[PDB]
Amino acid sequence: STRDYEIQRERIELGRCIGEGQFGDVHQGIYMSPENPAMAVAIKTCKNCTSDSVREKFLQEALTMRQFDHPHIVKLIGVITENPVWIIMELCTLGELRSFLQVRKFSLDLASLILYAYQLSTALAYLESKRFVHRDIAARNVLVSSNDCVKLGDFGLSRYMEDSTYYKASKGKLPIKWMAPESINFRRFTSASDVWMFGVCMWEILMHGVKPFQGVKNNDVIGRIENGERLPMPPNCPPTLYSLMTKCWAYDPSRRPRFTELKAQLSTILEEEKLQ
Ligand SMILES: Nc1ncnc2c1ncn2[C@@H]1O[C@H](COP(=O)(O)OP(=O)(O)NP(=O)(O)O)[C@@H](O)[C@H]1O
Ligand SMILES: [Mg+2]
Numbered sequence: 001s002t003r004d005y006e007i008q009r010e011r012i013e014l015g016r017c018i019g020e021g022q023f024g025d026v027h028q029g030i031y032m033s034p035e036n037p038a039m040a041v042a043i044k045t046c047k048n049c050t051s052d053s054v055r056e057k058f059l060q061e062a063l064t065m066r067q068f069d070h071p072h073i074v075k076l077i078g079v080i081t082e083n084p085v086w087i088i089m090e091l092c093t094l095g096e097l098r099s100f101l102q103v104r105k106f107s108l109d110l111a112s113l114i115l116y117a118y119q120l121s122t123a124l125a126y127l128e129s130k131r132f133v134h135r136d137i138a139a140r141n142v143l144v145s146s147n148d149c150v151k152l153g154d155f156g157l158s159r160y161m162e163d164s165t166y167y168k169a170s171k172g173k174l175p176i177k178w179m180a181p182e183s184i185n186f187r188r189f190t191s192a193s194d195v196w197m198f199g200v201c202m203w204e205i206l207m208h209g210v211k212p213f214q215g216v217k218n219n220d221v222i223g224r225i226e227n228g229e230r231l232p233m234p235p236n237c238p239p240t241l242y243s244l245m246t247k248c249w250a251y252d253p254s255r256r257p258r259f260t261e262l263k264a265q266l267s268t269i270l271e272e273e274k275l276q
Pocket of ligand 2: 136154155156157
């Protein structure tokens, strides 16, 4: 056996640019075979892939993704390691969640919103059981496969915990408004701080891709949160769901539900919504 991720460039047809990553343009394209063929893919490119250091940082997402196999985590298809260096993944054809929600607003009901939240909770309980911390949970990093299916991507910041306590910190303009207080205060990242971010993500989804604490300053937000202030209940969010969100935003990370618990409660809230 042994899964070989090295793909041949002849099997790839490069299509149009569909976005931008930190290392370069992302394209859609086609991955081909003589048999079991025509597969639409996303292709991340890398501007400066001649530098060992840039190349190493870029291919690390791919290294992290070869560990995962989940219906709601973006799948790694392979890599081309010869220059120009490419990362090949399954295409999420409907794109970014924020854009999708803002536009498909009048074609989606409440049950679809809770479903997306539920699907993400299964991907995160999966990571939680593998002792993997994401660190960048936000609707901006959720992608849409189809109308009834979202997937977590962006594994650039994702780290494997030896289960031992925290992660450290390197560099980057921190998404303060999504961050748990102990991540802002101690640069501490755990499954519990992922849960905090997921609560903010759920809020976003329920607000149809509106951003948390808009018009508020990154330094005023920290103080608001300490003083006990929380993001308001979204319009037509069920009281049971908002209660769930508020538990995710417990200042003490030990008081926050685990993902395995959130998964079960969302499943129950989803049935009640579809039922009533
Ligand atoms: N599998 C995919 N399918 C469709 N679009 C994708 C896919 N992967 C990436 N993209 C697009 O590329 C954009 C950036 O992807 P992402 O993984 O968040 O890159 P990044 O370098 O980590 N950017 P950042 O969010 O700042 O950390 C996404 O918002 C999508 O528009
Ligand atoms: Mg990233």
